Each structure stands twice: as structure tokens, then as C-alpha cells.
């Protein structure tokens, strides 16, 4: 069964490096494009990350230039999200996701366990 498994969250100090890993369980990871989004209480949720894992194509949203990075390891079938210079506003649940079909690269089908990010201000 296709499934997205998320690692544990992080409860670290602001102004720190933050890292998350998500594995596409039970699927050919190389072929389909994953994505990252944010969900928080009462927040206009936001699109974070792109990853076409075959060639490792990447692009970033407007607020995330430079700060946000991710990469992939095809052998591990795991996408590694990593944020630089953590801040209080980054507090949100993060989902590694997928679209209904691997034809268009958008995220409205699959969702992980929602590993949370908490900023110990």
C-alpha cells in the first residue's frame, strides 16, 4: 500500500537548523513528485516544497528563498526537508503529500502523520 511515513517532530530553540524526513512507503519513489505544506491553528496554510525525485528538481515559495532546502535519496526512498534559521512563525504541522495521480505535480491525495514543529521561544 502506498503510504507516507513521517519522522518525529522537533521542539528546538528558535534560530536553529531544523530537519524532517519522509519516506514514500510501498511505492516507486523515483517516479512521482512529492510536496510539502504547512498546517497550523487558524493559519492560512502554505505550500513549502517541491521535489521531483528523479532528477531532484526543486523550487521554493516567496517567503522561503534561501532558508528552506530539501533533498532526496532514491535508495532510501526518503525525502529530507531541512529548514535553516528557525523562527517563531515556523511553528506548524508539516505534511509530506502527493496528488491524486502522478500526472500533475500537486498535493491533494496523501498525507503523513503530520509531524509537528514547535519553537521553544
Amino acid at each position: 500500500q502506498v503510504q507516507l511515513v513521517q519522522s518525529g517532530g522537533q521542539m528546538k530553540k528558535p534560530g536553529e537548523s531544523m530537519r524532517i524526513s519522509c519516506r514514500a512507503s510501498g511505492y516507486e519513489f523515483i517516479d512521482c513528485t512529492l510536496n510539502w505544506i504547512r498546517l497550523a491553528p487558524g493559519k492560512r496554510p502554505e505550500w513549502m516544497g517541491w521535489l521531483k525525485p528523479r532528477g531532484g528538481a526543486v523550487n521554493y515559495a516567496r517567503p522561503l528563498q534561501g532558508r528552506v532546502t530539501m533533498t532526496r535519496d532514491v535508495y532510501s526512498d526518503t525525502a529530507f526537508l531541512e529548514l535553516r534559521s528557525l523562527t517563531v512563525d515556523d511553528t506548524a504541522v508539516y505534511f509530506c503529500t502527493r496528488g491524486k495521480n502522478c500526472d500533475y505535480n500537486w498535493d491533494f491525495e496523501h498525507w503523513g502523520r503530520g509531524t509537528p514543529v514547535i519553537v521553544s521561544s
Binding site: 498546517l39 492560512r44 496554510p45 505534511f95 491524486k100 500533475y104 500537486w106 491533494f108 491525495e109 498525507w111 503523513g112 502523520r113 503530520g114
Partner: protein, 101 residues
């Protein structure tokens, strides 16, 4: 720039009612809808403006051609409470929630 204004912000309805949520776009595209229960992963509900997604009953329906899209949820089951998000491929809005009256 919110180019998807869900309205009304929230609805307080008893079980079995028919909930209606409007979403207004201004750019050509696909209006799908999300739903997540409190503390649970989201699920696709409506796709392509009117079509139900997989595993979604006939309770949910949608429309229309034009800039305004009207989600409808007949026979409100309490499990369908929680937040919703109007969405299409490159667009989703602020989100709206349904609760007990």
C-alpha cells in the same frame, strides 16, 4: 494575495443539516475541496468543482461554471465537522470550519 475567498467563515449546524460553503476564484483552473477532522490528516472531498473524490459519499456535491463555486454537504454527519479548504491545482484559500449548533 488571496485569490480564493471561502465564505462564510464558519457554520454552526446540528447533525443531518445541509451545509453550503461558497468559494470564489478569479483565475482559470481546476475547485477541489479538502477536509481534515480535528488533529487528523486531510482528505480530498470534492474534485474538479463538482466531482466527489474516491471514498466520498453522495452527501458532498459542488458547482459551478464561472468564478463562484458552491460546495454543498447534505445530511451533515458529525464526523464531517472540522475545517475545509477550497482548492485547485495552484490555489487554495483561508479555510472554513463546520461545528455543532
Amino acid at each position: 494575495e488571496i485569490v480564493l475567498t471561502q465564505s462564510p467563515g464558519t457554520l454552526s449546524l446540528s447533525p443531518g443539516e445541509t451545509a453550503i460553503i461558497s468559494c470564489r476564484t478569479s483565475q482559470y483552473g481546476s475547485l477541489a475541496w479538502y477536509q481534515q477532522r480535528p488533529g487528523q490528516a486531510p482528505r480530498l472531498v470534492i474534485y474538479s468543482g463538482s466531482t466527489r473524490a474516491a471514498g466520498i459519499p453522495d452527501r458532498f456535491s459542488g458547482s459551478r461554471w464561472g468564478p463562484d463555486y458552491n460546495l454543498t454537504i447534505s445530511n451533515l454527519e458529525s464526523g464531517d465537522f472540522g475545517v475545509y479548504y477550497c482548492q485547485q491545482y495552484e490555489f487554495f484559500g483561508q479555510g472554513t470550519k463546520v461545528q455543532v449548533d
